[PDB]
From Swiss-Prot, chains A, B:
Outcome after substituting residue 241 to A: Causes a 130-fold decrease in the value of kcat
Gene that produces this protein: guaB
Subunit organization: Homotetramer.
Pfam families to which the protein is assigned, alphabetical: CBS, IMPDH
Reaction equations catalysed: IMP + NAD(+) + H2O = XMP + NADH + H(+)
Cofactor requirement: K(+)
Function: Catalyzes the conversion of inosine 5'-phosphate (IMP) to xanthosine 5'-phosphate (XMP), the first committed and rate-limiting step in the de novo synthesis of guanine nucleotides, and therefore plays an important role in the regulation of cell growth.
Residues involved in K(+) binding: 293, 295
Lineage: Bacteria, Pseudomonadati, Pseudomonadota, Gammaproteobacteria, Enterobacterales
Residues reported in the UniProt entry to bind NAD(+): 241-243, 291-293
Keywords: Acetylation, CBS domain, GMP biosynthesis, Metal-binding, NAD, Oxidoreductase, Potassium, Purine biosynthesis, Repeat
Protein name in the entry: Inosine-5'-monophosphate dehydrogenase
Binding site for IMP: 328-330, 351-352
Entry domain remark: The CBS domain of IMPDH is a negative trans-regulator of adenylate nucleotide synthesis, and this role is independent of the catalytic function of IMPDH in the de novo GMP biosynthesis. Deletion of the CBS domain derepresses the synthesis of AMP from IMP.
Regulation: Mycophenolic acid (MPA) is a non-competitive inhibitor that prevents formation of the closed enzyme conformation by binding to the same site as the amobile flap. In contrast, mizoribine monophosphate (MZP) is a competitive inhibitor that induces the closed conformation. MPA is a potent inhibitor of mammalian IMPDHs but a poor inhibitor of the bacterial enzymes. MZP is a more potent inhibitor of bacterial IMPDH. IMP dehydrogenase subunit of E.coli contains a cysteine at the IMP binding site and is inhibited in a simple competitive manner by GMP.
């Protein structure tokens, strides 16, 4: 009964091809699900050491999409989603505000805590002043030291980012207040954010232009109050994440959630076989995750399928569904990403890679890791003659290496 | 002549399957021989650093069955068996007693040595008092300080463990004396033992409810006085253990022992081929052990078959005999156990694993090792869609990995 | 300028004629004129060294520990009060439980005090007792009244009963705990079997005139020292340590004088000094005992450059106070058993230690550190021919080594 | 207080005018007034240093070893008696075998004494000899009578025969062993070829008036010292060492006085002291030699704080005994050959060592440790101009180094 043969990343190499593709001109975009299109093929995994609201924003601005983890309160997990959801490429709807009668003592705690010293001043939604770093080098309430209503530089909602950069610079100020017909605060946008959005203009957003975001839950029932709470928080894609997704209890959860939310984008995981991939698709998954022990699952449980064979078997299973496959774990170096995609994955998940970054809960700023990795994928596509992630997943051939 | 190909644990992985099996509800029981059923698929090996009476009791209470080693006197080996055999789940028949005229000086040596300070007091079988830790904080003979006959809390043989827990608690005491119609001591059972037997209620016992136990001998004749002495001591399964069990001298011993004890459960080992497995079965083995160099046997002698192929070849050989196969040695991690079973073993032997424990002759208590390992097997069965050890040995498919 | 000054390591004790064995030597010494110790050892007033638990253990070995001042004034009083409520083996005001108490709260009440034996009291009267045995099985959720040994089955002894007696009652009933009661069956205290055995094996407890374990506490320069003083005096502290990085200050001397005024009665330890004139200041300000040690953590000297090597320091204080009957404690610099003996030989009437006990069970086991430290002292007493601490303070001779 | 005190490392020996070569220097020195050594070295009374085997080897190099007191009184007497039964090269009371003895027991009798040559004695008379040669082949199981060289083929010498003579008999017959016999052909002892060669190459054995190797033993404070004393006196010990961690005790002084009473005759070493008045006590109590060394295992000072640096110690004893003719031994602190020379120069008449020999073949090889240690002494004797130990004790000069 002891026979088949299966292949991992280190077992294969990608062959070079005639190419007209250049690294800086390859297109890194890919359909995560039939309705969500990433600009880079990367997801951050929902681990308490990788992804909360901070990194999810950082990654969606890069082109990707982060997944808030369930090792936190139901209510704290929903507010994380809302925090990403209230983000644009570079405008912050629902900023952290103050009121005129905020004491200035209580105001320096907000800045010591929040890391930015600049807040719009409000009065039940009506914008009323603004108080920033410069207005604190003295001692009373905000109202004494705030820049009053009549001198506020603002922009109506809809005005393009350039018109606000013009305005911000002409007025020699760092914070633009987005404002209503009735002067109700609708958004805050710094000079920092507009520069960081003219470069890297490939944020992954929905049809309302707001940052896309995922969230994970486990299966096993009882998660209904949670699954409902992240939907209510307007998550883009719900992750129903399992150590073994071909079990009946997981298929069940997925069947149930698809009933209560016919258009919500769901990833089920993790499978490792064509059967699991079909059953996860058949229960209602928008995309399936693949990663059974690629890892103590192997040493402890004795169970696993190496990623190269697992991905390509899930993908063969699902031809003609439009249900994409995510490769999850086993990721050592950058070229492993390229192999995973070449084996037919439409995106990859990573978590250990990003677990020490700045924007995560030994460090780095996210934009540099994503750059080194995405430059590696760019190299590969130029070498394989593959302009789009579409081309790579279907064109590039493999070669088997030994030692 | 230099051709075949053979597979070890690290050469294979177990594939995931559709599953309705949960770890905490999988059934770990398996037929060791046609008449002995373990509750977990584990044997401890008969090594002077692993298994004597202490660990054999510890393991049989867990579900398994330990094998007393032959690196000790014939007479000391039989008394080890009797010691396990006089154990129930949690009642000690033939406790360590005293008599009223035992000096109390000689009594503290018994406690310094034996590790428990509580002994029933007897007078040629008649129970007569009891002396425990509390009765020593003074200085004469036992008779001065013992709790007299008329105040002894006892229970007739047959009373359930709960009725004795009731009685022990109602009387605010830690030791229950099991007693005859004629007040002859028949057993001792502490409060400790009843708690440790309400949890972990899967002790592996015979039809008299007494702890099961194995014992090893070598072949090569002259062992007859020993083989007879362990039978006389009421061992459950005799191990006739050899570096090479397909030799004629071992087949012979086994043929002879089966003649003198037609219903004694015998394991012969070790073989590594279908031929050896058939010949060991044909000589009269209840179960065959498989492990030729999986180990200096390999480096020194140059000889061996990797376990995965050896097990599955022995098991194919023996289809339709009801003679089970034990995988022996080569065991690194927990998932190796699962692979061995999946290759068709009905139990596994381990020894190095348990060589530092508490209950063995760098440590641990046995119940924790057996827990971590059996939880690993439980993981695997949930992943492979396999509820019983029966299902695992016959359903779960394999996948071949390289590097 | 420049006068030579020796540390412990610069000296060695001379063997003299000896009629003293280790087992013979008398380790007792007068802390102050009212307070005599049974081993010449003090615990430092440090958050990682001495609190109520350790101050009771030191006392049971023969010494005194000092409760640190890193607490609210009220919390420290209870520490000191907690020590004071231990006699020989009796334990006054033991923790009780009411026959209402739920067992889920009773076992809640177990994991934090450590023990499981609580007397059951119902608004003054003593009605039962629960021990870990009664807890073993859930009654059926009911309360403590449904597991307890009841009043008509309580084994008690009248207060004043000899300790050897209520031990024999304890053996005869085979029970671990003894209830001590007044003539109205009111709970005077709890005495366990374990305590009585640690009172034959530790007959050298440094106790009070009412039989209570002894204890000290430290106050500092903080802007509420006055009230800290009074809290401890009223909480019944045996000795007060006005403790200073630099006791030859006018701030300390102030406090020392102001306190001896308000409390003509209270045994006072002032420190630290390292000079004769420093010792005179603390004495004349009204101290019972001077603590010496400025310099002997070796960052005092490094960051500041200030210090006096311990042996010269101790011996200048002793000499500056020659005739006054004011004792001198040696604080810090003490690594080995042999440093203790040198401190006492230079005239210290007792020794303070902190980091030598900082990782003990009683620290925030200790029976053993004291046994080997005091065992070396005994060795040294035998080798030098001094069987009384007062002998080793005045008799032993020194030799300069390189 | 405080008088300076030097160790070995604090001093250096001054070169003086010298007419002495290393080969010239006379290493002999008077242990006591009856006992003179040929090298100024003693073995310590330690379970891992000196027993009968080593006490014979030290004696053959010129010194005396001391049998430890970690034994039954009777077992120690046999140790001491065992040493005493070696003359120059003769070996009295050698192990014999009876013509009954089975060879399976004879070879059993080989692996534990080490050797294979046993004289064969049948109830007094000498009847043969078996050596490893006769054992080589099984006779056919028979006994020793069937392999032995028989009486009519025995090569013997009459007791009193010169050692050079019975060597030449040995060569002439080409046999390894020589039997020494009285005028009745009774076995007086055994002399091997190996011994005679180690008696020309080691002509400096510290022997007794009957020609017997010399030896000492230690008694302690234990509750049966009296009988330990007598066992050794009767077993024929040369010197008795009443040995103490602290000999300025009234317990030792007691024992010293009580023994010199019972034995006006017996050469006694008392120790250890480290003071003049300590040396006087031991002398006046009736000692032949005082052992010095309290402090020089360096845990004496660490656990206890007590000790005197070895050089000051040795020199205070020597001076305190100036005129009495009582010698002084220096015990411990001795690492190098150069420490020995400093001890003797400070006035020690001899030196004790333990850990310097603790891992030798003769310990529970040694010819070599003594050769290099004594070779350095010779070097130092040449460089300082002292050819007699008495010279190096009184002539050499010291210089203080840092
Ligand atoms: N009140 C707020 N609520 C939410 N996010 C805010 C708020 N104020 C600032 N931010 C965000 O946090 C970032 C911190 O920027 P910060 O206010 O320190 O910079 P700045 O003062 O505009 O710029 P500079 O550092 O050039 O002086 C902003 O760029 C914006 O992304
Ligand atoms: N949109 C705005 N309309 C009117 N005044 C504004 C606006 N944004 C900022 N200001 C005011 O301009 C001044 C500086 O604002 P800005 O955010 O550029 O400074 P800052 O963050 O305090 O500067 P720094 O870079 O020194 O930390 C403050 O008095 C602030 O209240
Ligand atoms: N006389 C005996 N002979 C054989 N086995 C015994 C004997 N007495 C006790 N045992 C076993 O050894 C164990 C040691 O238990 P022990 O007597 O120290 O506990 P106990 O006093 O009943 O309990 P506790 O620790 O709660 O006070 C018992 O739990 C039982 O398994
Ligand atoms: N079955 C019994 N019948 C009568 N008396 C008993 C019985 N078992 C124990 N005792 C008595 O009860 C008392 C305590 O018994 P138990 O075994 O509970 O205590 P222990 O092991 O000495 O306690 P500890 O937990 O303090 O070590 C003793 O006097 C003992 O003789
Ligand atoms: N209610 C209490 N209040 C204060 N101190 C207590 C109390 N109970 C116990 N102690 C202290 O704790 C110790 C006894 O605790 P413990 O509960 O472990 O005794 P025990 O179980 O009855 O004796 P053993 O464990 O030997 O069978 C005593 O030394 C005693 O000082
Ligand atoms: N003074 C007393 N009077 C009456 N009953 C008592 C008394 N002290 C304890 N008991 C009862 O005796 C039993 C427990 O005895 P004890 O307190 O001496 O041991 P324990 O510390 O609970 O047990 P263990 O040693 O097993 O931990 C309980 O039923 C308890 O209520
Ligand atoms: N019977 C004996 N009794 C006591 N000592 C003995 C006895 N026999 C030998 N010795 C000691 O052992 C040494 C000789 O032992 P050994 O048996 O090795 O001599 P050997 O074989 O005759 O000489 P070689 O080995 O050089 O040929 C001597 O130095 C001697 O002191
Ligand atoms: N004094 C003696 N008189 C007669 N025969 C002797 C005498 N000494 C030894 N022999 C005999 O000489 C033979 C052995 O000679 P010797 O004892 O000198 O050497 P050995 O130590 O046995 O041998 P080896 O050097 O080979 O170990 C034996 O036959 C022995 O009995
Ligand atoms: Mg700014
Ligand atoms: Mg700025
Ligand atoms: Mg007990
Ligand atoms: Mg108990
Ligand atoms: Mg107890
Ligand atoms: Mg030879």
């Amino acid at each position: 009964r002891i026979a088949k043969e299966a292949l991992t990343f280190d077992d294969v190499l990608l062959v070079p091809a005639h190419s007209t593709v250049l690294p800086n001109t390859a297109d890194l975009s890919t359909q995560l699900t039939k309705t969500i299109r990433l600009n880079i093929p990367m997801l951050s995994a929902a681990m308490d050491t990788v992804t909360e609201a901070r990194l999810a924003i950082a990654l969606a601005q890069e082109g990707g999409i982060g997944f808030i983890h369930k090792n936190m309160s139901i209510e704290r997990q929903a507010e994380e989603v809302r925090r990403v959801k209230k983000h644009e490429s570079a405008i912050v709807r629902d900023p952290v505000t103050v009121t005129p009668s905020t004491k200035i003592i209580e105001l320096l705690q907000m800045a010591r805590e929040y890391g930015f010293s600049g807040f719009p001043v409000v009065e039940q939604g009506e914008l009323v002043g603004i108080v920033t770093g410069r207005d604190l080098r003295v001692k009373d309430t905000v109202a004494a030291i705030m820049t009053p209503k009549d001198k506020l530089v603002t922009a109506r909602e809809g005005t393009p980012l350039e018109e606000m950069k013009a305005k911000l610079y002409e007025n020699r100020i760092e914070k633009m207040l987005v404002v209503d017909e009735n002067f109700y605060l609708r958004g805050l946008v710094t000079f920092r954010d507009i520069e960081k959005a003219e470069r890297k203009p490939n944020a992954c957003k929905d049809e309302q232009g707001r940052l896309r975001v995922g969230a994970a839950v486990g299966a096993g029932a009882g998660n209904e109050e949670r699954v409902d709470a992240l939907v209510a928080a307007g998550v883009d894609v719900l992750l129903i994440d399992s150590s073994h997704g071909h079990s009946e209890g997981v298929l069940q959860r997925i069947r149930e959630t698809r009933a209560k939310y016919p258009d919500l984008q769901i990833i089920g995981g993790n499978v490792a076989t064509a059967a699991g991939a079909r059953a996860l698709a058949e229960a209602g998954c928008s995309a399936v995750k693949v990663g059974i022990g690629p890892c103590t699952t192997r040493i402890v449980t004795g169970v696993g399928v190496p990623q190269i064979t697992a991905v390509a078997d899930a993908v063969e299973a699902l031809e003609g569904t439009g249900i994409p496959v995510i490769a999850d774990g086993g990721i050592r170096f950058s070229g492993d990403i390229a192999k995973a995609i070449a084996a037919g994955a439409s995106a990859v998940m990573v978590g250990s890679m990003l677990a020490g970054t700045e924007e995560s809960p030994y460090k780095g700023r996210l934009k540099e890791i994503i750059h080194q990795q995405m430059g590696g994928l760019r190299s590969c596509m130029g070498l394989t003659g593959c302009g789009t992630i579409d081309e790579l997943r279907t064109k590039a051939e493999f070669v088997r290496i030994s030692g």
